[PDB]
C-alpha cells in the first residue's frame, strides 16, 4: 500500500495559509509525536484524483467543495462521521456544501467569495456597474494608471460578470440537464469582457500574478479577489477597500461560492488521526486563527470564531458578494463545467474564436456527459430488452444520435458476433464485480489506438453485446452502471476530440445516409 502510515501528508493551494496550517501541524506533532507535513503542488485539484485512484496521494486534500462530488463518486474520499456535538460547531449551511449522495464527504473550513478591491487613494469611490469602467480607465490612463485588472486567465474571476446578466451552471436540485452557459446573459456578459479586451481597457494576458503585481505595486485602481490576497495587499501598503462587485445591465454580479474543505483520502491508512487533527487541532478557534493570520480565510465555518471576525468589513463585503452569488454545486461534472468555460473564456479573450463559437464549445463540453450517458443508456437498454425507452429526450440530437446508432451498431453487432461472443466468453460476466472489471479493460484497449467514430461505435455496440447477455442471465441491474463505464472511457478520454467534432451532431452528421 502506497501511502504511508503513522504521519499526514496534507495538501492545499499555493495561495492559502499553508505556513499558517503548518503551525497547526507543529502542535499536532508536539502532542502525539506525529509529523504533519504540508505541501502545495501545483495543479493539486487535477493530481489528487490521478493519483488517489491508484491508492496514493495525501493523507487530506484541500479544496473548494465543487471537486469534491467527482471525488467522492470516483471512491477517492473516506466519508466522514462526525458527531453531533463536532456538527454543531460548524454552520449548517457549511455541511450541505460537503454533503454528497447523503453523506458528508469533507469537513468544511470557510466560505469564500470575490471582491472587487480597490485603491482607496485613487479611486475614492468605486465604480457600482461595469458599465462605467471603460470611461474611468481612460481617465486613470491620463494619470499613468489603469481601472482594473485581474485574473483572466481562470474562469472563476470571470463568472461574476458572465452569470449576471443570465448565465448559470447547472439550474437551481441541480438539474444537469439545464446548462446555462450560451445562453443570452452568459454571451452580454462575455462580450462586455472581451470588448473591454478590445478597447485596450484590460489584456487578455494578464494572470494571477500580473494583477496582484499591478493592484499591490499602485499602478491599476482595483481588482477582484478573495479573502486570500489580502495579506500581500496589507504588505504593499496599498490603502485599500473591499466592496460589493459592479453590477452588469443593472443586476449583481453573481460570484460562485465556495467552501475551503478538507477531505480525507480513501487509501489512507491515517484516517483516525487526519480526523482528530482536522476536528480538535484546525476546526478550532486557536487553529483557525493561525491559518488565518498567514492568509485570510473569509468566512469561517467554525460559528465561534467566525463571530469574532464577522466585526470585520472585508468580510461583510464578502458576505455580501456571497449573497449576491450561488454556492457552488458538488455535483461530478464540475470539472467538465470548469474546463470547458476556461477554455472558452481564455479563445474569446484572445480573439482565437468569438463569442458565440466559444460559448457554443463551452456548453457542448459542459453538456457532453450527460448527452453522452442519455444515449448509451438508452441504447444498451433496448438492445437489451427489445423495448425502447418511453421517456423524452438535446432532444433533437439525441433521437438522431440514437437513431444512427441503431442502424450502425446492430451492423456491428451482427458481422462482429463471433469476435464479441469470444470476447464476451472468455470474460466470466456474471454480476456487478465483473462489469466493473471491464472498463478497466476498455481504457487500455479504447484509448490505446486511434481515436474515431467507428471505435466508438465498436465500444458501444460490444457494450449492447454485454447487456443483452446480462439481461438473459438475470443481471438487468448491471446495464445503467455498464452504460456508465462505457459513457465515463468516452468522455474523459476524447472529450477534445469530441468537442471538436460537434459532440453528437457530428456522429449523426459522420455516419449521414
Ligand atoms: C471490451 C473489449 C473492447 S472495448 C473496445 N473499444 C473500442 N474498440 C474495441 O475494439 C476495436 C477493434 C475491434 C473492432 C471490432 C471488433 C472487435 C475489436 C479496437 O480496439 O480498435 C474494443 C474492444 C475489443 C477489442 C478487441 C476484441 O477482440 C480482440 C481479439 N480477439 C482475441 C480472441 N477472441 C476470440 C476474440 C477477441 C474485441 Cl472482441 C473487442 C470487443
Ligand atoms: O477557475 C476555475 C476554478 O474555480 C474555483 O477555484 C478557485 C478556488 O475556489 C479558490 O479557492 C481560489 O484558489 O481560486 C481558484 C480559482 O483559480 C473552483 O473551486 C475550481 O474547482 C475551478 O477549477
Not at 451482427?414 to 470474460?427: C, D, P, Y
Request: negative net charge.
Amino acid at each position: 500500500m502506497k501511502i504511508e502510515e503513522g504521519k499526514l501528508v496534507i495538501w492545499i493551494n499555493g495561495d492559502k495559509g499553508y505556513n499558517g496550517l503548518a503551525e497547526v501541524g507543529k502542535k499536532f506533532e508536539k502532542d502525539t509525536g506525529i509529523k504533519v507535513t504540508v505541501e502545495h503542488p501545483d495543479k493539486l485539484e487535477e493530481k489528487f484524483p490521478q493519483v488517489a485512484a491508484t491508492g496514493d496521494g495525501p493523507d487530506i486534500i484541500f479544496w473548494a467543495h465543487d471537486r469534491f462530488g467527482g471525488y467522492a463518486q470516483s471512491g477517492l474520499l473516506a466519508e466522514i462521521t462526525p458527531d453531533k456535538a463536532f456538527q454543531d460547531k460548524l454552520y449548517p449551511f457549511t455541511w450541505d456544501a460537503v454533503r454528497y449522495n447523503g453523506k458528508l464527504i469533507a469537513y468544511p473550513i470557510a466560505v469564500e467569495a470575490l471582491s472587487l478591491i480597490y485603491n482607496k487613494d485613487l479611486l475614492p469611490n468605486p465604480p457600482k456597474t461595469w458599465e462605467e469602467i471603460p470611461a474611468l480607465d481612460k481617465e486613470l490612463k491620463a494619470k499613468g494608471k489603469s481601472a482594473l485588472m485581474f485574473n483572466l486567465q481562470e474562469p472563476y474571476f470571470t463568472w461574476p460578470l458572465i452569470a449576471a446578466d443570465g448565465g448559470y451552471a447547472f439550474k437551481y436540485k441541480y438539474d444537469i440537464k439545464d446548462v446555462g452557459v450560451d445562453n443570452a446573459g452568459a454571451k452580454a456578459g462575455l462580450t462586455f469582457l472581451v470588448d473591454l479586451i478590445k478597447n485596450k481597457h484590460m489584456n487578455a494576458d494578464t494572470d494571477y500574478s500580473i494583477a496582484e503585481a499591478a493592484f499591490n505595486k499602485g499602478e491599476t485602481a482595483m481588482t477582484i479577489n478573495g479573502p486570500w490576497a489580502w495579506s500581500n495587499i496589507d504588505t504593499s501598503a496599498v490603502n485599500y477597500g473591499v466592496t460589493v462587485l459592479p453590477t452588469f445591465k443593472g443586476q449583481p454580479s453573481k460570484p460562485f461560492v465556495g467552501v475551503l474543505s478538507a477531505g480525507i483520502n480513501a487509501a489512507s491508512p491515517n484516517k483516525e488521526l487526519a480526523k482528530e487533527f482536522l476536528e480538535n487541532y484546525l476546526l478550532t478557534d486557536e487553529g483557525l486563527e493561525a491559518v488565518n493570520k498567514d492568509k485570510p480565510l473569509g468566512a469561517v465555518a467554525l460559528k465561534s470564531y467566525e463571530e469574532e471576525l464577522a466585526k470585520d468589513p472585508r468580510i461583510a463585503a464578502t458576505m455580501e458578494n456571497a449573497q449576491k452569488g450561488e454556492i457552488m454545486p458538488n455535483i461530478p461534472q464540475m470539472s467538465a463545467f470548469w474546463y470547458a468555460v476556461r477554455t472558452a473564456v481564455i479563445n474569446a479573450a484572445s480573439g482565437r474564436q468569438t463569442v458565440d463559437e466559444a460559448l457554443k464549445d463551452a456548453q457542448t463540453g459542459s453538456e457532453l456527459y450527460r448527452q453522452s450517458l442519455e444515449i448509451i443508456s438508452r441504447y444498451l437498454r433496448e438492445q437489451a430488452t427489445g423495448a425502447a425507452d418511453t421517456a423524452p429526450m438535446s432532444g433533437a440530437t439525441s433521437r438522431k444520435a440514437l437513431e444512427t446508432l441503431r442502424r450502425v451498431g446492430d451492423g456491428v453487432q451482427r458481422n462482429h458476433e463471433t469476435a464479441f461472443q469470444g470476447m464476451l466468453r472468455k470474460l466470466d460476466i456474471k454480476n456487478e464485480d465483473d462489469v466493473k472489471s471491464l472498463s478497466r479493460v476498455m481504457i487500455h484497449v479504447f484509448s490505446d489506438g486511434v481515436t474515431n467514430w467507428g471505435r466508438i461505435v465498436t465500444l458501444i455496440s460490444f457494450g449492447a453485446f454485454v447487456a443483452k447477455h446480462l439481461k438473459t442471465i438475470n443481471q438487468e441491474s448491471c446495464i445503467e452502471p455498464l452504460a456508465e463505464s462505457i459513457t465515463d472511457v468516452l468522455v474523459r478520454t476524447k472529450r477534445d476530440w469530441l468537442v471538436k467534432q460537434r459532440g453528437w451532431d457530428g456522429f449523426v452528421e459522420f455516419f449521414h445516409v
